[PDB]
Design a binder for these strands. Sequence first.
DNA 1: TTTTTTTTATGTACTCGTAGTGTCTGC
DNA 2: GCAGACACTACGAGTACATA
Lengths: 369, 369, 366, 126, 126, 343
Amino acid sequence: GPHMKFTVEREHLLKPLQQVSGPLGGRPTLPILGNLLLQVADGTLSLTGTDLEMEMVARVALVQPHEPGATTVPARKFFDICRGLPEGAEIAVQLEGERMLVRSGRSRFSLSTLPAADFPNLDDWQSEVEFTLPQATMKRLIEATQFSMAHQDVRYYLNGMLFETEGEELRTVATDGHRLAVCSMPIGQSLPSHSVIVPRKGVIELMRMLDGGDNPLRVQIGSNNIRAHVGDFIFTSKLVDGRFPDYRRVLPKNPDKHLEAGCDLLKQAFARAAILSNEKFRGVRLYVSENQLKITANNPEQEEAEEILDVTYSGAEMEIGFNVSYVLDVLNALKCENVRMMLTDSVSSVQIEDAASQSAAYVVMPMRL
Amino acid sequence: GPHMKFTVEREHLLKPLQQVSGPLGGRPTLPILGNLLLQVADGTLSLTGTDLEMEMVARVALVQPHEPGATTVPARKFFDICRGLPEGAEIAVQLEGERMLVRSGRSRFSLSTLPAADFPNLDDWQSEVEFTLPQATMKRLIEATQFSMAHQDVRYYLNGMLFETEGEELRTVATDGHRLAVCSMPIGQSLPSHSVIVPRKGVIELMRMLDGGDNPLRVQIGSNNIRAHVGDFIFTSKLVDGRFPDYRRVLPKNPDKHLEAGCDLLKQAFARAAILSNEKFRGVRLYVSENQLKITANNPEQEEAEEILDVTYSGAEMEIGFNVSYVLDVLNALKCENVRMMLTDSVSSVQIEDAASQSAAYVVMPMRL
Amino acid sequence: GPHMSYQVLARKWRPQTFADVVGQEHVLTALANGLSLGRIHHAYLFSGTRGVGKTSIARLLAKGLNCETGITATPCGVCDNCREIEQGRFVDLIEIDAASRTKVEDTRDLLDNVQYAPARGRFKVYLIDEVHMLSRHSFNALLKTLEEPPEHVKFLLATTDPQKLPVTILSRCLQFHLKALDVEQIRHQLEHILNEEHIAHEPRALQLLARAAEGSLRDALSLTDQAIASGDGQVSTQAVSAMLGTLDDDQALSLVEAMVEANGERVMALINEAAARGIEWEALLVEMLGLLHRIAMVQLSPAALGNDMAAIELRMRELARTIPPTDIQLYYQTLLIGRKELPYAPDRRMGVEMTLLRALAFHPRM
Amino acid sequence: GPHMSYQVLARKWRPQTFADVVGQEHVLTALANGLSLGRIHHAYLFSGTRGVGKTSIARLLAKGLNCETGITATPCGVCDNCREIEQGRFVDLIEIDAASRTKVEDTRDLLDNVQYAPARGRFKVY
Amino acid sequence: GPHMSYQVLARKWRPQTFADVVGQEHVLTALANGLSLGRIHHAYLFSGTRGVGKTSIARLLAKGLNCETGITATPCGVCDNCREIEQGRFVDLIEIDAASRTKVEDTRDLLDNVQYAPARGRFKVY
Amino acid sequence: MIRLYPEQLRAQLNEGLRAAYLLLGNDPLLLQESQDAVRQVAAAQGFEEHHTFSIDPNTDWNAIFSLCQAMSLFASRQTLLLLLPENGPNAAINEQLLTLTGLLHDDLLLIVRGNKLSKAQENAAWFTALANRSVQVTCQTPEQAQLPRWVAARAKQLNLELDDAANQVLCYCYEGNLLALAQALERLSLLWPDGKLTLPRVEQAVNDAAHFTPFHWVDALLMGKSKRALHILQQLRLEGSEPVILLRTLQRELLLLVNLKRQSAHTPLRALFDKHRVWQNRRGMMGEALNRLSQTQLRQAVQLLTRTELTLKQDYGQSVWAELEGLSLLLCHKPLADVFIDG
DNA sequence: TTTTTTTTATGTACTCGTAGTGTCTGC
DNA sequence: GCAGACACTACGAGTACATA
Ligand SMILES: Nc1ncnc2c1ncn2[C@@H]1O[C@H](COP(=O)(O)OP(=O)(O)O)[C@@H](O)[C@H]1O
Ligand SMILES: Nc1ncnc2c1ncn2[C@@H]1O[C@H](COP(=O)(O)OP(=O)(O)O)[C@@H](O)[C@H]1O
Ligand SMILES: Nc1ncnc2c1ncn2[C@@H]1O[C@H](COP(=O)(O)OP(=O)(O)O)[C@@H](O)[C@H]1O
Ligand code: BEF
Ligand code: BEF
Ligand code: BEF
Ligand SMILES: [Mg+2]
Ligand SMILES: [Mg+2]
Ligand SMILES: [Mg+2]
Ligand SMILES: [Zn+2]
Ligand SMILES: [Zn+2]
Ligand SMILES: [Zn+2]
């Protein structure tokens, strides 16, 4: 009969459960959507977690005798059962009727199950392009671009992040209409040019899914979905049929001014200005001179903040105001020693880059103030 | 309103500012409740925070020129301004009318104030008794009974905790009508039994003030108010008026059944069993048999959980149903290795105690059996 | 278990083709013509009273819109899409119990899937059931979606009260209002359903079951199942008549009819029954007073019938025509005095009996 | 009689089988016929005045639904399920006191667990 | 000072035993018979006019029910439970001014807390 | 400050968008059509980003910060839509609109809709700040005198043959609900592809979804139309309007009627109406009402009204919706009322 | 063509924004 | 450490509805 005979080690099980339980959350669209799909087959267990737009499957090898089968188990309950058991303790699992018996030494739990046929399964597809990337490369691509992504926008185009691939270069683009972040990294393989959209939750799962090890990462992009392989984890998410602009078009094609400044000092100054800036109407103004890069802000409390830097400059004076939070996010994403800032006009865009790196580019749109 | 020129260093203020921050900001119920009281007097700076029923002031030595006076400065704004400055950077403050100009290097901030007279204070009083207890001992007293306090119960008594003394012993009692937590520790001094009731919030700030240092916490017990002293920090609060339930009347009269086991094993087993417990009641049934403990848990989802513990027991088997959250909290407070339990009947209170020493004790009232 | 297998008449016999929906001809014909000409509005909002097929017709629309044979008024059962509609497991049909997912979080999560193309259907069809209860912010999100809807998404809203819906959603939705089913159609389909199953039935019993339900087909089928259970496997006239007498509620009307005809035994039996069916005597007497007021008013102008008496009009017209206004005025005065006098009397059943006796004593009937 | 525990007559003499219920011949006959013949509906509403039996008959139907001897119109007192129902400790007889759990969140919680199958019972009763 | 505040006769002369009642004999006989035998009930509703004794009768019933002498028709003032019931501060006798707390939230909290076992009392009297 | 009708909106829309458009009125259909036309022409002019905000005492007020004047990153011209509450703006909403108008620019087009503003609010600072920049659109429901012409015009818009009897039926059933009328015309076009409209089915594909107001009921009472008055009362009861507003609306006019009838024995009604400041629309109506009614009928009406008020505010009963009905019949073309039924 | 128009006291849900509290994760 | 993040839970406020 169909029995989920399992004899696993808690150390081989905690991490895969910690990964598969990520995308799952409270209040699912269906009760089946709130239960992880266990599938023991051949000699491995597949852990499946889905949101109707994701499938996160973790394969764990087995040694002890077991019988094939498929069922579902509550995510949080089973994960905490695995977590709470002592280090190095075996976990035995069985299925009796509609009850999953989880035993360990003398501890015994009987969780409620559901049929495995009702669990949705994403349709099969063919991969159009395949990438092989290091963990650090994808990590930097995501962390340096995802901050500028839009949030719950009416235009569904901007809810995600764009991957643009050309030759031996892969770049990530993210914008909300006011900010834009792009980052390009090299790859050792020749790849066709392709632009693809990944939803916000999809890129969040992609970022959390990759480990800190040296295991290579595999990417597959098809017609309408994306898949990622990392060790024994496979994550597949649907895409978005969207339109995105040129990064070169948004950024100043012919920059007019150049600034080079220390990142930490500018972060501290902008935070200090944001202290007295309106909590909702977050925004400051900068006035540029050869050395003075004054930052000014004020609140409806008539509390004013003005601060001065010592930044190299040789051009004309300029007054440009914009949201403080945008530049704070840009600087926090930079994590560099020195920052270069390019200004063209008050009603035109403002570019920010790493003084010793062209890999990542950031542009902010200043607001009239 | 004389000019107010502070000239201070961050390292001498950020810790006092954090200590005086406490329950400020958050919910502003009325404006003149205010933000801070800054007072310059005799080469010392007194910084005061309040809650319309509580007060606490930090004393900072002024080793530089100053101007005596009293005014106010916004809590969050001042705290974040001081925090965000470069490490070790000096602070220069000037007063113009009702405006505070705060300067750090080339950074300038303007702040609004309120008249110091409009601030609400607490009337002075004659102290009744006084203790000088070591910080570690006071922390042990508070942590052993903090968790058991009631959560906005109608019985106002349960909303706080009682400190009483008998000769050289200081006893602390907390309860909520279902849990009892008593802890008696030596003092070294003999004072008459003057019981005092401290509300939950006040206890929270007492915990926050303690830093585990060598300086003994001084306390002045009054009639309807409380005062505390930690180094340069002074504190005061109101008191809950009434009488606590007699703990000796709550402790079991015939603790005939004895049990002893390891704290870690029991805590881990109860944590495992609470996963399947009823999230609205968290009731678990305990079966005590010869040298064996059994925990059983059920939830509306009809899931069953059983756990068995090796234990030493010489009495008769017994069934008793009680909350698992309460025993988990008790075991969390109890930081030693071996824990003893005294039981009388299936619907009798259970006493939890340290096996190493009497020290502190706890009482749990069972659920419906 | 050991009882073979017997489903519920309410859930079973739900139509699977547009020709199996009984009544509501105008809605079905309009939908058929709209699908034929290719003129489909962005959002269809169904409305009407309980148990007239709003959800069933919406489900039929969702089955039709994604049929592989093409958009048609009569989708086949052949299509695997059609079969998945039958089983309730269709990727391209999103059934949202808006009565349960009222919060803006779940509604926004389910409405953020508009950006994704349908898996195996021409149109991503949302069946938001019980739309009337929905948080205001969820209405804002739904309005923002409907303002700029993708061409591959059609909305199918269903509700019982369309008043609670905001006007901003009504102005963007093609609204189809469904009538309460006529008694003859209800009786006809009840006869056909009872004949299709192996259940004997009687004509008068069927008419009683049809009339008992207040124009709602689900009510008729539920009463049919309950009567079959009580009828020992047979829909017999006496059993269903006794059942409906037990479930009879409009006591006040029968009390008025017996009182105006001076039938002492009938009114005593009626008040005994109303006592057995535990109710409030003040409420019964207020209902009697209101019915008498309405009868007095109708004689002045027929337009007083209104809409509430749609299922009561037949008896009220006869009562208004056959009874002089003076007698109605005297009865109203007697019942008003009795209601003023009721609480101070003995147990209120005694007081109601005494007031009815007072009213009966006026006529010369012996 | 012999029970020194003077249990309240309102509690001790709660009906055990359909033969112990006085009056209400309508509902009794309807339930007996709809359980002997089959065709068990999925929702019942007992409407009546106070102290007539609006709950005890529901418990009797619950006993009659999931009994060890199958769907029966005569609730036995021998199998574990019926006695567990009577003691109020039965696993699947979820007694929702709607007066306490009246908020919509609690109803959503109740509906969330509806599909999680019954344990030691033919049906789960809400 | 025996009277820190004026212990008005309406408060000082509250009955302490069943013998101080001014002649509510019809209910007192039933109460004494019930306590003397094992016939005890879980819901008593005393009603009548203002200032007639039903709160005092209820307090006397609680004293008789919780005194450590036993279930006595005549409570003993020597009992510690009686000593605490006559004053305030009894862990078991929970007196709720219903008009003071009419909200359903307080009643729901009370019915959540009723599940716990009584502390050192035979019956948790509400 | 331009003023227009919906029919003329295209004339302003095809000429060039102004700084802002104000859509004032109470017709959901007319306001929706005007807003949709403005949005369509703005999209034709190159407006892509649309943001809708509902003015509420608790709503978000990020619209002020939404005017970043920096969309240039994508450079998609924005359209802002604001929904005024049922009673219109308040003081707080007043200064919110002040600060929104102060930040208006060329790249943004503002669409403001809601119930028609009163004279006290038509002089508000923000509304004045929209002078020479705004186009008000008047969308007020045509009355039954003008409704059939509008129905015929919309039928000609859809190229459907409308019969006079069908027009009358649709006007009677859908009074005060223009959106329902448009939906009915669409539904009857779908039901009959031939395009004609006659009685046998327009009387079938229709419901009593009419929406009324207490003023309509009082007008029906003054004109003595019992059938219309009772139908209006039934529609108002089904809609759920509070009976107290009906009581007050009828009380004002009934007290005025009593005073005018008392004074008519000494002064002509023409001067009495002017003294009491009765508008030309209602002068003839009240004249006919006075000529129809006697002092006894008005006294019976006020007695019934008082009894209804007492039974509403003292017994909290639900019989009011019946008593009002009788009051209707008490004042229309020989009431023939009773005493015990009301007195 | 234009404005016209409300009865409170007490209580109970419902839903969203903001803050207070725990805790624990690679930071 | 560890504080921020992130969850999670609670509380106020605005809104809708019920009963008397
Ligand atoms: N027009 C109809 N034709 C046939 N059956 C109907 C119709 N309307 C209602 N029913 C019956 O009532 C049951 C439930 O109908 P449903 O369409 O869910 O009502 P609702 O409008 O309240 O959602 C159906 O299974 C069907 O038996
Ligand atoms: N039909 C009946 N037959 C026998 N006892 C009954 C009947 N109705 C009520 N009772 C008595 O009332 C007690 C509780 O009845 P219950 O069924 O809870 O009424 P309710 O319908 O109000 O919940 C039972 O224990 C029983 O003694
Ligand atoms: N039966 C009684 N015997 C003695 N004193 C009584 C009696 N009934 C009332 N009293 C007097 O009335 C005062 C209030 O009595 P109480 O029991 O509170 O009446 P109630 O039933 O209205 O709450 C008591 O303090 C006592 O002096
Ligand atoms: F499903 Be229906 F709205 F009763
Ligand atoms: F006591 Be019954 F359920 F009303
Ligand atoms: F004053 Be008593 F409680 F009726
Ligand atoms: Mg439905
Ligand atoms: Mg009951
Ligand atoms: Mg009393
Ligand atoms: Zn098909
Ligand atoms: Zn059995
Ligand atoms: Zn005693």
